[PDB]
Amino acid sequence: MEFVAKLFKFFKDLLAKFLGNN
């Protein structure tokens, strides 16, 4: 996975630990 996608995924996954899979 390209770097910008890896980094976007990291923050989206982090937010999901708080708000859920949705």
Which parts of this chain interact with a second copy (CB under 8 A)? Answer: 3-8, 10-12, 14-15, 17-19, 22
User: How many angstroms separate the CA atoms of 9 and 7, rounded?
Assistant: 5
Would you count residue 16 as binding Cl ion (CB under 5 A)?
no
Q: How far is the CB of 3 from Na ion (least distance, A)?
A: 14
User: Within 1-22, where are the H helices?
Assistant: 3-19
Q: How far is the CB of 9 from a second copy (least distance, A)?
A: 10
Would you count residue 7 as binding Cl ion (CB under 5 A)?
no
Q: What is the dihedral of CA 5, 7, 13, 19, to 10 degrees?
A: -110
